[PDB]
């Protein structure tokens, strides 16, 4: 496995701009050495949970691909970024599979994503006809039809525009503050491994 380039974890974690959770961002990481040590002992991360593998063993592991999904939600919703969860985020925005293999990291981004008066650029989907399949993404803006009456593309009675804005303000309480979230998915196929820890 001839690999000498380091995986671009800093490009993901240290980006200036994060996507709204309904249009969540995905970067494919392959063909590189993954130095997870820059993630260890962070004074920033309020959530570091892994699934299927132990964090302590990440430098000894090889994967066919790694996927870096990133987005912003509110603090109270970080718990939904996990297998088996339910809620507006898990049902309508970002869904992890029951057999998820990977890690979920999150940190408070009040200093970057709040604005006195309200930062209305971060949206989430509130209504949807059915729940998302794992790793599905829905960016439609079709008016949600809540009654027997067709909506004909216009908001109204029983006819709601499906996205809603977080409107983050720095004075919000912690549960309503913006959190930046990175989901690393460790994909293993019947193919040679392209992402490996420094110890492999």
């Amino acid at each position, epitope marked *: 496995p001839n690999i000498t380039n380091l995986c671009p974890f800093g490009e993901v974690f240290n980006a200036t701009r994060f996507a709204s959770v309904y249009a969540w961002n995905r970067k494919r990481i392959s063909n590189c050495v993954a130095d*997870y*040590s820059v993630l260890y002992n962070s004074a920033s991360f309020s959530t570091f949970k*892994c*699934y299927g*593998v132990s*964090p*302590t*063993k990440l*430098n000894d592991l090889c994967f066919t691909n790694v996927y870096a999904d990133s987005f912003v939600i509110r603090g109270d919703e970080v718990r939904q970024i996990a297998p088996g969860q339910t809620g507006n985020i898990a049902d309508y925005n970002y869904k992890l599979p*029951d057999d998820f293999t990977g890690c979920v990291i999150a940190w408070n981004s009040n200093n970057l994503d709040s604005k006195v008066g309200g930062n209305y650029n971060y949206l989430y989907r509130l209504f949807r006809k059915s729940n998302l399949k794992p790793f599905e993404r829905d960016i439609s803006t079709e008016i949600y039809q809540a009654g027997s009456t067709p909506c004909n593309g216009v908001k109204g009675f029983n006819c709601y525009f499906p996205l809603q804005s977080y409107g983050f303000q720095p004075t919000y309480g912690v549960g309503y503050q913006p959190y930046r979230v990175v989901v690393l998915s460790f994909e293993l196929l019947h193919a040679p491994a392209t992402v490996c820890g420094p110890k492999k």
Partner: antibody
Amino acid sequence: QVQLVESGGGLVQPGGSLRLSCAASGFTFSSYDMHWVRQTTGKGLEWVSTIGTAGDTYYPDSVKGRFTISREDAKNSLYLQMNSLRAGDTAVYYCARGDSSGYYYYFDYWGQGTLLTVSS
Amino acid sequence: DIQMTQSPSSLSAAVGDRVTITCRASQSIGSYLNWYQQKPGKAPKLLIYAASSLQSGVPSRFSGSGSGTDFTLTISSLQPEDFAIYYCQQSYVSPTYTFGPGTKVDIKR
């Protein structure tokens, strides 16, 4: 024969601090993750802290900011510094070796426990 | 995290009896489940990992089965030295490993 031996438990006043030690023998200490797990009659077995082989430390929210795990591989030793102790921290504290078979992780070796009593 | 529940709470059985205790995870965890035995004054002892692999040195009368959310520990023939509390533990979510509340196995004589 793998052995783990805890030391340092005892009486400590609320708000005080205390260090627990665990001395390991019978294996290559540097090659394994080490853990602290506490036990109380009311809440059973509870994970307290973990240190890997890359300097990485992990704590539950109930413990972050108050406890610090560390290791001295040159002396095959594990430590848990504890600050701002509350009555609810009274427990038996075990050190435990972690290992894995494939992706499956387990605690294959435990110390004898050391009793921490937090009381004025 | 993931909550673990055990059944029964306690059990009285005779020597030679088949003992069966069950563990349930609050969500699907595949085979990421271990079983531990704890005798009075002693630390837990690993019996089973990966839901069904017998740890080295553990007697063969101990066995684990199950996948997903429900798991079972079985003692084929209860011996007196098996009096203890048995705990299950999910190894799916780290670092926040969580333990079941335990099942006490008393010996009837």
